[PDB]
Design a protein around this ligand. Structure first.
Ligand SMILES: [Fe+3]
Length: 820
């Protein structure tokens, strides 16, 4: 007559026991088979926790188990859900409920605040999976009501305990109330600035601008999106806030007080950062050393020294980054390996308006290029010509960026030749500047060719620097921020707003959203905000984020699929006779080759999962939640692009597979590939400069003479200054770190996420496949014939797409989601 249940929870101080007893916590089971006069599952009596269970060893993570028994006669049917009310003042983290001999499992993993804070009682369902048409009739209304609850009403200031998911534009980055200089255009909701939506917070208008959301000490995210951590060192996402608000000011004072040289004077001054370290004022070290996360960033003598970790890129050769070989190799195996494109005609063309920027014809001449004996026509025809083209992307912003004090850039284009040995070599760099009548600047565009000696070698080195500044900016704002963090949030919101926790697609996709809204919210507050980390360390300054909006104009969901991307960029061609359906034009393109393996593994997984819940196309078209989910994801989440024809319709099994496959790819492998190499490659500022401060010098000037006499100083004066470098290195170190509680691809935070053994078996195969894939990539990295592109002169094995990783700054490991 009684159902024995076990409640596992975590007291707030983990992320005593006895206080949970008495009438502190009550649970009411809900029948999925027996309904009341309204068709709603019958609800049992309030049952309180009875005592502390201390039986099964399998119970870690500061978790505690509680015995409880429910008065549930077989006449009440089978329990399929349950209500829970917390009478204690402090919230606790509910892990799960297990009902024995009837076993029924509930995976909750949710914060339960005091009952008085909730409009309706917290409800949790058993781990069964149901498309809408399969929902037991007694749970149907509870299913839709919980979704209605999750959607809220689009109004109100969100509170810490709310679990309300909604959309809003990026109108919370500027800080006009503090200063007109901190005013920023609203990104999203206009044709001028289209942009993915983000999680609604509702703080209200600023005093000076009704279109901009006022500042807030805490940027809200639905409660369960804010991941707690057993180990403070794992709360990596809070690092950005501490860095911007506490550490950055401390660094600045050291410079304002002239306690450390304002500029790096030689490359060794930069290498010093991870060798002997940098000596800073005691009160500066004292301000940093006690902060969680931040303190894991540097070794210190506790008094004056801060030592950064040695970046992977210099671990074997501290000078290899300067080679043309590495410069080109990082375009296919570096931090930003997905921008290079095939070049099929010569010279490269521009779609920009010459009336505005001046004649846009390229000044690169074919006869000036060293293509290893190949003629231009031969290189073009054999598909050996490629380019890293930032000309059209940057040109529209060069004038405004260059009007800034201490910022000067070129819209660059780099031509690459695929040598017969399979490696890429850079053969020319065009440094373009806009030209319009009345220009005050005498600076002109120019082409720089490879050179190993003399001032020509310095000019070529600086040319590579201007290119990588373009690339770092594009990598951070587009490849990384826009394409992963920002593009994914809309889908997270829609999933919670329209797919029930019961829905198979919810279970398939949500693991790939872990910590995404959380890091994004913290990003809006300290990373991409007016005068935030990115604006204060990257070239575009106050134009940074709006540049990503301009790029978003051309963002295409279906082109995020890896095969489509490779084909679109001209680095692969459709080839039905191949395993992946595409033939790579650069056969040893690490990112793409390893990527296709992961892509295929995810595809197989999705294709094996969907069939378990959708027998035919009609079953997809007729899933009400799924249709509302996709419709909102598109028309609201990415609403500024709802008019585009390429959006899948989601009326077929094929379409569902495609959409889920792309979402999973972006959240896991794509993000991992562009994220975890940030410090490994960019930890040496010379290798990944984030900004450039001056254009090439005119012959006959002291600056030109410096290029001849002190090329390292010329280089350092051109790239990111020492102060912003310290800040940027710290943020990318944080962002390249894997928390020890990360959940990787092929893993789930709970083995009982679904009761369906079929889905569970498919997932297990997916995991074994990923392990199988890793062995293969290891073999690729150990293959001497692939050393040129997979390791390079920096001898850094390409491990960014290895599925697994231990915690730390490992340069490998694919998390399920955009978690940092
Ligand atoms: Fe990231």
């Amino acid at each position: 007559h009684k159902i024995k249940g076990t409640v596992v929870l975590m007291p707030k101080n983990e992320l005593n026991l006895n206080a949970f007893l008495g009438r502190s916590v009550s649970l009411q089971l809900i029948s999925a088979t027996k309904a009341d006069a309204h068709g709603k599952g019958k609800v049992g009596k309030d049952t309180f926790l009875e005592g502390i269970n201390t039986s099964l060893p399998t119970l870690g993570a500061g978790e505690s188990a509680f015995n409880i028994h429910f008065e549930w006669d077989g006449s009440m049917g089978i329990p399929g859900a349950f209500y829970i009310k917390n009478y204690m003042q402090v919230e606790f983290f509910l892990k799960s409920l297990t009902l024995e001999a009837i076993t029924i499992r509930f995976v909750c993993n949710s914060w339960v605040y005091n009952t008085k804070l909730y409009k309706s009682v917290r409800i949790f369902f058993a781990n069964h999976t149901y498309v809408p048409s399969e929902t037991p009739a007694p749970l149907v209304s509870y299913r839709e009501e919980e979704l209605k609850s999750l959607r809220g009403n689009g109004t109100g200031e969100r509170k810490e305990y709310d679990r309300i998911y909604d959309y809003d534009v990026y109108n919370d980055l500027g800080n006009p109330d503090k200063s007109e200089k901190l005013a920023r255009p609203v990104l999203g909701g206009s044709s001028t600035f289209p942009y993915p939506r983000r999680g609604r917070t509702g703080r209200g208008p600023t005093v000076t601008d009704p279109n901009t959301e006022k500042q807030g000490e805490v940027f809200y995210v639905p409660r369960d999106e804010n991941l707690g951590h057993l180990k403070s060192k794992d709360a990596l996402e809070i690092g950005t806030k501490s860095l911007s608000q506490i550490v950055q000011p401390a660094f600045e004072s050291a410079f304002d007080l002239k306690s450390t040289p304002i500029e790096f004077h030689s490359f060794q001054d930069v290498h010093d950062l991870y060798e002997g370290g940098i000596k800073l004022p005691r009160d500066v070290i004292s301000t940093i050393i006690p902060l969680p996360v931040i303190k894991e960033l540097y070794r210190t003598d506790g008094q004056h020294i801060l030592k950064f970790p040695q970046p992977h890129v210099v671990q074997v050769s501290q000078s290899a980054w300067m080679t043309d070989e590495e410069f080109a190799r990082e375009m296919i195996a570096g931090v930003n390996p997905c921008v290079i494109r095939g070049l099929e005609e010569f010279p490269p063309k521009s779609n920009l308006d010459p009336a505005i920027y001046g004649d846009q014809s390229s000044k690169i001449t074919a006869d000036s290029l060293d293509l290893d004996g190949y003629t231009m026509d031969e290189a073009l025809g054999s598909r050996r010509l490629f380019m890293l083209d930032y000309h059209d992307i940057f040109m529209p912003y060069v004038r405004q960026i260059n009007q800034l004090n201490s910022a000067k850039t070129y819209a660059t284009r780099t031509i690459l030749f695929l040598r017969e040995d399979g490696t890429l070599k850079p053969v020319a760099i065009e440094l373009s500047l806009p030209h319009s009548a009345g220009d005050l600047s005498a600076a002109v565009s120019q082409v720089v060719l490879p050179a190993k000696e003399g001032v020509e070698s310095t000019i070529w080195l600086l040319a590579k620097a201007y290119v990588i500044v373009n690339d770092s900016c594009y990598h951070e704002l587009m490849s990384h921020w826009l394409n992963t963090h920002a593009a994914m949030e809309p889908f997270v919101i829609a999933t919670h707003r329209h797919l029930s926790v019961l829905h198979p697609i919810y279970k398939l996709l949500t693991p790939h959203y872990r910590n995404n809204m959380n890091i994004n919210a913290l990003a809006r507050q300290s990373l991409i905000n007016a005068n935030g980390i990115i604006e204060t360390t990257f070239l575009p300054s106050k134009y940074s984020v709006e540049m990503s909006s301009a790029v978003y104009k051309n963002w295409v969901f279906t082109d995020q699929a890896l095969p489509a991307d490779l084909i679109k960029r001209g680095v692969a061609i459709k080839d039905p006779s191949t395993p992946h359906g595409v033939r790579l034009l650069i056969e040893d393109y690490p990112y793409a080759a390893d990527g296709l393996e992961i892509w295929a593994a995810i595809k197989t997984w999705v294709q094996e999962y969907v069939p378990l819940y959708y027998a035919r196309d009609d079953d997809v078209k007729n899933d009400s939640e799924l249709q509302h989910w996709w419709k909102e994801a598109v028309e609201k989440g990415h609403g500024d692009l709802k008019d585009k024809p390429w959006w899948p319709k989601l009326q077929t099994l094929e379409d569902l597979v495609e959409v889920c496959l792309i979402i999973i790819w972006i959240a896991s492998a794509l993000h991992a590939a562009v994220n975890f190499g940030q410090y490994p490659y960019g930890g040496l500022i010379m290798n990944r400069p984030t900004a450039s401060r001056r254009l090439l010098p005119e012959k006959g000037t002291p600056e030109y003479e410096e290029m001849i006499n002190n090329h390292e100083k010329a280089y350092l004066r051109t790239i990111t200054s020492k102060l912003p470098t310290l800040i940027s290195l710290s943020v990318i170190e944080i962002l390249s770190t894997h928390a020890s509680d990360e959940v990787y691809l092929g893993q789930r935070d709970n083995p009982h996420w679904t009761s369906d053994s079929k889905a569970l078996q498919a997932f297990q195969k997916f995991g074994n496949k990923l392990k199988e894939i890793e062995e293969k990539l290891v073999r690729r990295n150990n293959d001497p014939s692939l050393q040129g592109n997979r390791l390079g002169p920096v001898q850094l094995p390409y491990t960014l797409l290895y599925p697994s990783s231990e915690e730390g700054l490992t340069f490998r490991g694919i998390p399920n989601s955009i978690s940092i």
